[PDB]
Write a protein that binds this DNA or RNA. Structure first.
Ligand SMILES: [Mg+2]
Ligand SMILES: [Mg+2]
Ligand SMILES: [Mg+2]
Ligand SMILES: [Mg+2]
Ligand SMILES: [Mg+2]
Ligand SMILES: [Mg+2]
Ligand SMILES: [Mg+2]
Ligand SMILES: [Mg+2]
Ligand SMILES: [Mg+2]
Ligand SMILES: [Mg+2]
Ligand SMILES: [Mg+2]
Ligand SMILES: [Mg+2]
Ligand SMILES: [Mg+2]
Ligand SMILES: [Mg+2]
Ligand SMILES: [Mg+2]
Ligand SMILES: [Mg+2]
Ligand SMILES: [Mg+2]
Ligand SMILES: [Mg+2]
Ligand SMILES: [Mg+2]
Ligand SMILES: [Mg+2]
Ligand SMILES: [Mg+2]
Ligand SMILES: [Mg+2]
Ligand SMILES: [Mg+2]
Ligand SMILES: [Mg+2]
Ligand SMILES: [Mg+2]
Ligand SMILES: [Mg+2]
Ligand SMILES: [Mg+2]
Ligand SMILES: [Mg+2]
Ligand SMILES: [Mg+2]
Ligand SMILES: [Mg+2]
Ligand SMILES: [Mg+2]
Ligand SMILES: [Mg+2]
Ligand SMILES: [Mg+2]
Ligand SMILES: [Mg+2]
Ligand SMILES: [Mg+2]
Ligand SMILES: [Mg+2]
Ligand SMILES: [Mg+2]
Ligand SMILES: [Mg+2]
Ligand SMILES: [Mg+2]
Ligand SMILES: [Mg+2]
Ligand SMILES: [Mg+2]
Ligand SMILES: [Mg+2]
Ligand SMILES: [Mg+2]
Ligand SMILES: [Mg+2]
Ligand SMILES: [Mg+2]
Lengths: 180, 262, 124
RNA sequence: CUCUCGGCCGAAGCGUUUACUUUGAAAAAA
RNA sequence: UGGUGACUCUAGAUAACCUCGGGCCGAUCGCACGCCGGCGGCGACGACCCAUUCGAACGUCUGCCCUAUCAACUUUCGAUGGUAGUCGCCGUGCCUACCAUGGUGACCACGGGUGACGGGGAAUCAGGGUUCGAUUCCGGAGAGGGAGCCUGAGAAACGGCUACCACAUCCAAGGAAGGCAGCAGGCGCGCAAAUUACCCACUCCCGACCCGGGGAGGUAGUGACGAAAAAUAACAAUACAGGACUCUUUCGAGGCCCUGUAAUUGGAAUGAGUCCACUUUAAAUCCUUUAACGAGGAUCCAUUGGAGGGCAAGUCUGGUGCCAGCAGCCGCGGUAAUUCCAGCUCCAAUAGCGUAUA
RNA sequence: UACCUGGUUGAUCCUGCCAGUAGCAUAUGCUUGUCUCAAAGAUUAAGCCAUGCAUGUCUAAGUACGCACGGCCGGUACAGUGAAACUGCGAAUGGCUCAUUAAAUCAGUUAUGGUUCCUUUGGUCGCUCGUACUUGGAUAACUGUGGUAAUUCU
């Protein structure tokens, strides 16, 4: 026996019919627009949303007055709000089922950086984050798919270590300055 | 297995000890003692985990050998010596005195006490037997056995015991209109007043108890422990007054505590 | 000149004779501070000598701003010498281990498991 | 559904007995 | 006297009993030293017996996969029950003695089989199921096979012992010694599985013990079982090539959007690596932190299967000519092969992707 | 995500299986830059096993006359560290494996009023009317004489 945790999960599920024009096109678009790495990333999101839709659907069969529906529901809606997907107007239970993929593909750090206009192309963005130029609050984030909370959005920066915001020049300007 | 088992696997440890999966295969395996192992606390959990005083088993060991820790006024140098419900831990060096009571949620919590109140404890009386030239005997839940008690003490009654002399000062009889805590069970850690007690011959006796919020619940009589006479508890109560919370209201407890924080 | 010591959780054990606490370190440009340095800053806060204080378990957060650890500060040097787990004393160089391996004393053990009384000492 | 004690209500009864149902307490942790 | 739902309970009184293979009553240890030749403080072991804790051991009720090419089964040798015992730690056909003739069975006994340790669980799933659970928790069994005991609170113990069987080591030939289904590692079997590594620092355990010990455990090594995050380029100009909005009857114009291709230019950005020092840690390692070097073409280059239909994608180009061959299935190959063998192209998933098998 | 396509006929609607399609585990082929986790001689042979290790243990408080050390002051019975050996305790846990085992094991459920229990915790421990200011013998380490090719023999 040992001191080790065995728990783990799969973060996605692969589609039932491998080849269909429809799926392929729709998922390609999703890939291109948000600058994802592979079809997996799409299925990943698609699956995380899918879970939520399951929880909701299995609350909705319960009566309103039930303690569990009230409590568990309010929690779910709350998480869903503070990530930025839902609004506080729509904060009823059913508007959950009214959710689409794009909505999570919104709140990825990769896209947020390109929306805030810190990077000038979506792909430029994915590079920029991975390149450590990007930071949240005081924290440097190395991952393109890092879902950005509603309240943590107001500070997303250029990370005072970097050339861009933090005033030390990179390797490349260093060499051209050592020649001149 | 030939004969008794000396280890405890970490995972099979009693839940309310609050241990982690990650830091070992084992857990402390309370030494044999006064409180049933499933139910109790080992000194080493309490001292290094609840209190944070010591980091490791070893630092604890160095604590008990300076003979600091006293349980019911006597030095216990065994680190896995079990302490249990209604028990007193006195640390002379810090002047800190802990009694062990159950939380609302069913865990032993750190609960601090006046050096005054620390001089006694409560016990449940498990049975009464006469022996050896007609001399009556008490057996507490602490396993302390006591002779020549007041004949008025019957079973499931609480006694107040001076920790100095180990002699009963006075007692509380078990009846409706008295004030109890559930010691183990589903409802463990709750506090209420006995409403009713129903008797099924050949089985467990069922007790109903009502709150300060008026909620009612049942347990098995063995799990009930009579703390106080009428509405007033003899022991200090823990910070949570001993009334449980629907999750929902607890969330709002937290939230209001977040909005009033700042 | 830019290094910062803050101390987060802090407690005093009368019974281990120590001020036992969590150490936070800000070091924006530099690599992680060495311990022999951090002891000095820490020391001049609590006014005690360097000797008596022991810091360990330093961990640096991703992206290189901060570092977190523990430290504990003993009343007398001697108290430390009793209470501290030995390896930490040895990083200061006070205590010294024996350099015999496990195979060593194991082998010797099973060797002298084979002889009677005074002969046991004659083996190695 | 009804009488013997105790402070009009609790213990005492039973009503044929089950199945079904709701509720309680007990259901090791992972 | 006290207690239960209920005692042949607990306590009391009477008569006696008391094991030489003996029951209790302390012939013991330490530290302080003090008091009126005497007195005593704290502890350590002991101890019969209660009670308690950890249990353990037997019972209660309900629940298991396949099989009729197993329909009757058990009872002279206990089957079922009775009465008295013996044995045991006690309840009991547990065993003996004597009686009775029972007990089980289509609600599937009895017998056989199981690539059967049972659970907690796992995989898959609309609802219902089906399959798997040797494997880290709980329970059971076993230490080459059987059997039998010493010791003890506790084993019918195997890192105790005594045999027999099977194996195998040493020998001066008389004798002696064995038990990896602990860790490593080796052989064999096989489609199928890691280092004769370092440690008691953590976790707990044992001990006369704060001090000793622990292949329990921890840490490294090997590791594409599997699971998580995630590089292989981004940008700008031009060069066009293009396209959409605007203007113009058209020619054309646009400084307005985009896109590709550029054996086009351009410096900016970084990790992979190399590598000082820190940190990490029992000592190291890794990660993280950080100096120094470190990105322009075959480099610091992505591969695995496919390209008739199912099923996403070629009426290409050269070779083969019912052969070599592919092809899960329908099928393709007999001189213009959209299916073979290849070059070009594109297509699916992507640090993964195919095959076979449950 | 409550899902189906190809295949019998000249063509059609069917019953119907074969084939496809997605997971999941074991193997395996080709390939492989980064980081976090992590299973791993179960299936067949509960087949066999060199070598090393895996269980020992002392406080102030059971026995010290080893000079082994020192050790002081030396008629102090014993100052003190202390190998060994006697004693006490532990070796019944833990670790491994899954051969056997089908109301057996096992799970929930109950019982012990039908029993045993080292230890721990508290109880008891001048309740008995009858050499003690201390009793008897032996044995181990140690000293020595030995035996046997051979041992954790004696
Ligand atoms: Mg075992
Ligand atoms: Mg009962
Ligand atoms: Mg559970
Ligand atoms: Mg009989
Ligand atoms: Mg009998
Ligand atoms: Mg007979
Ligand atoms: Mg089997
Ligand atoms: Mg099975
Ligand atoms: Mg199993
Ligand atoms: Mg294994
Ligand atoms: Mg097991
Ligand atoms: Mg066995
Ligand atoms: Mg074998
Ligand atoms: Mg023993
Ligand atoms: Mg045996
Ligand atoms: Mg062995
Ligand atoms: Mg064993
Ligand atoms: Mg092995
Ligand atoms: Mg081979
Ligand atoms: Mg393998
Ligand atoms: Mg250790
Ligand atoms: Mg040690
Ligand atoms: Mg191991
Ligand atoms: Mg490795
Ligand atoms: Mg593979
Ligand atoms: Mg992976
Ligand atoms: Mg590396
Ligand atoms: Mg390049
Ligand atoms: Mg190819
Ligand atoms: Mg081709
Ligand atoms: Mg095809
Ligand atoms: Mg097609
Ligand atoms: Mg094929
Ligand atoms: Mg084909
Ligand atoms: Mg396939
Ligand atoms: Mg036909
Ligand atoms: Mg046809
Ligand atoms: Mg099929
Ligand atoms: Mg790196
Ligand atoms: Mg095997
Ligand atoms: Mg098997
Ligand atoms: Mg011995
Ligand atoms: Mg003991
Ligand atoms: Mg005692
Ligand atoms: Mg001799």
């Amino acid at each position: 026996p040992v001191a080790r945790s065995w728990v783990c999960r799969k973060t996605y599920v692969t589609p039932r019919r491998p080849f269909e024009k429809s799926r392929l096109d729709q998922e390609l678009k999703l890939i291109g627009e948000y600058g994802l790495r592979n079809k997996r990333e799409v299925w990943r999101v698609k699956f995380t949303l899918a879970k939520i839709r399951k929880a909701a659907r299995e609350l909705l069969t319960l009566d309103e007055k039930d303690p569990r529906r009230l409590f568990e529901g309010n929690a779910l809606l709350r998480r869903l709000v503070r990530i930025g997907v839902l609004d506080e107007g729509k904060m009823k239970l059913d508007y959950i089922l009214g959710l689409k993929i794009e909505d999570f593909l919104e709140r990825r750090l990769q896209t947020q950086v390109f929306k805030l206009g810190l990077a000038k192309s979506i792909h430029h963005a994915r590079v920029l984050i991975r390149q450590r130029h990007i930071r949240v609050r005081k924290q440097v984030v190395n991952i393109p798919s890092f879902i950005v909370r509603l309240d943590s959005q107001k500070h997303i920066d250029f990370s005072l270590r970097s050339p861009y915001g933090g005033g030390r020049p990179g390797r490349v300007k260093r060499k051209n300055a050592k020649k001149g | 297995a030939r004969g008794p088992k000396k280890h405890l696997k970490r995972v099979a440890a009693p839940k309310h000890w609050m241990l982690d999966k990650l830091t070992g295969v084992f857990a402390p395996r309370p030494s044999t003692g006064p409180h049933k192992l499933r139910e109790c606390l080992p000194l080493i959990i309490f001292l290094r985990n609840r209190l944070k005083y010591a980091l490791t088993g070893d630092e604890v060991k160095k604590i008990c050998m300076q003979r600091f820790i006293k349980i019911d006024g006597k030095v216990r140098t065994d680190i896995t010596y079990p302490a249990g419900f209604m028990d007193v831990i006195s640390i002379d060096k810090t002047g800190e005195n802990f009694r062990l009571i159950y939380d609302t949620k069913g865990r032993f919590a750190v609960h601090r006490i006046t050096p005054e109140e620390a001089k006694y404890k409560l016990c449940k009386v498990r049975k009464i037997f006469v022996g050896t030239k007609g001399i009556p005997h008490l057996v507490t839940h602490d396993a302390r056995t006591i002779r020549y008690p007041d004949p008025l003490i019957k079973v499931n009654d609480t006694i107040q015991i001076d920790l100095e002399t180990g002699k009963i000062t006075d007692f509380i009889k078990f009846d409706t209109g008295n004030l109890c805590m559930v010691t183990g069970g589903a409802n463990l850690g709750r506090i209420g007043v006995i409403t009713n007690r129903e008797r099924h011959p050949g089985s467990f006796d069922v007790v109903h108890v009502k709150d300060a919020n008026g909620n009612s619940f049942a347990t098995r009589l063995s799990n009930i422990f009579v703390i106080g006479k009428g509405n007033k508890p003899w022991i200090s109560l823990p910070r949570g007054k001993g009334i449980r919370l629907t999750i929902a209201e607890e969330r709002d407890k937290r939230l209001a505590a977040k909005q009033s924080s700042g | 000149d830019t290094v910062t010591i803050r101390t987060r959780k802090f407690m005093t054990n009368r019974l281990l004779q120590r001020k036992q606490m969590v150490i936070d370190v800000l070091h924006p440009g530099k690599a992680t501070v060495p311990k022999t340095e951090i002891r000095e800053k820490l020391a001049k806060m609590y006014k005690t000598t360097p000797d008596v204080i022991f810091v360990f378990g330093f961990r640096t957060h991703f992206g290189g701003g901060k570092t977190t650890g523990f430290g504990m500060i003993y009343d007398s040097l001697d108290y430390a010498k009793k209470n501290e787990p030995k390896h930490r004393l040895a990083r200061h160089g006070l205590y010294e281990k024996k350099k015999t391996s496990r195979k060593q004393r194991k082998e010797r053990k099973n060797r002298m498991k084979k002889v009677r009384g005074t002969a046991k000492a004659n083996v190695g």
